[PDB]
Amino acid sequence: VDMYIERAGDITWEKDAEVTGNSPRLDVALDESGDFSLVE
Amino acid sequence: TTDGVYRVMTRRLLGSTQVGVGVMQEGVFHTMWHVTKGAALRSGEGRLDPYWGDVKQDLVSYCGPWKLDAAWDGLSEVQLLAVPPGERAKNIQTLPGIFKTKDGDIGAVALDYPAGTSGSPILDKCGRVIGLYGNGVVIKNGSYVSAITQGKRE
Ligand SMILES: O=C(Nc1ccc2c(c1)CNC2)c1cc(Cl)cc2[nH]ncc12
């Protein structure tokens, strides 16, 4: 068995978090392979 | 077996490479299908066998059924608990955008990380996992926008 897991942290909301990223509204299509493409 | 966020590593490429990330909750390991392609996983001396998965949803669970059932409320900021290759886990707060599809709308997070960050959890203000980061689109500016991908709890 090749692949292995290793703990990286707790799942907790952090009050001090950095705030970033925009909020785009995008038209997309999902194919049978689970791949999204822009309908643009 | 402790609840929390985990890296998914392989030795099949150069050295030890991080192919993705996942969530341990209620004894079940949750990640994106494209991270493991459904292969078994090692945790120390233990084995984790796939239990459920779906290529089109791009999700997989190990040791039991998908447990994560919280959903983005469609209004509030969220946190990506990003776990990049070789880097400390860090919370990034953001207001999701929207993917509009023929089958309905899904939240989306516009944060650019390397592909081995796939499976990092997205959290609500209660610390509930509302989906996994790592399946989305490349936009004009070359950056990633990820769906907030969530499974169904049977
Ligand atoms: O490629 C990425 N995800 C992905 C790979 C294979 C498949 C799917 C998604 C869904 N079907 C097969 C990816 C992930 C992240 Cl976190 C950042 C990225 N920047 N450019 C690509 C990606």
Side-chain angles (χ1 to χ4, degrees), chain A residues 2 4 6 8 18 20 26, chain B residues 5 7 9-10 93-94 100:
Chain A
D2 159 62
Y4 61 100
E6 53 182 45
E18 180 195 358
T20 203
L26 304 168
Chain B
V5 63
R7 315 175 185 272
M9 310 296 298
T10 186
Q93 185 164 319
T94 198
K100 320 260 302 121

Side-chain angles (χ1 to χ4, degrees), chain A residues 12-14 16-22, chain B residues 77-84 87-89 91-96 109-113 117 120-124 133:
Chain A
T12 302
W13 179 280
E14 300 293 347
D16 56 15
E18 180 195 358
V19 181
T20 203
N22 69 302
Chain B
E77 291 181 358
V78 305
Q79 292 185 354
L80 172 64
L81 185 49
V83 186
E87 298 180 348
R88 208 152 24 92
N91 294 64
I92 314 285
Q93 185 164 319
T94 198
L95 183 73
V109 299
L111 296 175
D112 202 20
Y113 282 97
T117 316
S120 294
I122 304 156
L123 314 188
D124 69 17
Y133 173 85

Side-chain angles (χ1 to χ4, degrees), chain A residues 33-35, chain B residues 34 55 58 112-115 117-118 133-135 138 144:
Chain A
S33 299
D35 297 318
Chain B
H34 76 260
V55 161
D58 194 30
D112 202 20
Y113 282 97
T117 316
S118 295
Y133 173 85
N135 196 20
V138 174
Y144 214 58

Side-chain angles (χ1 to χ4, degrees), chain A residues 1-14 16-39:
Chain A
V1 175
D2 159 62
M3 286 183 188
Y4 61 100
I5 67 171
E6 53 182 45
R7 201 174 193 272
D10 287 3
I11 292 167
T12 302
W13 179 280
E14 300 293 347
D16 56 15
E18 180 195 358
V19 181
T20 203
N22 69 302
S23 63
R25 178 181 174 97
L26 304 168
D27 292 328
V28 301
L30 182 59
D31 76 10
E32 295 304 294
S33 299
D35 297 318
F36 284 104
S37 60
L38 280 181
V39 185

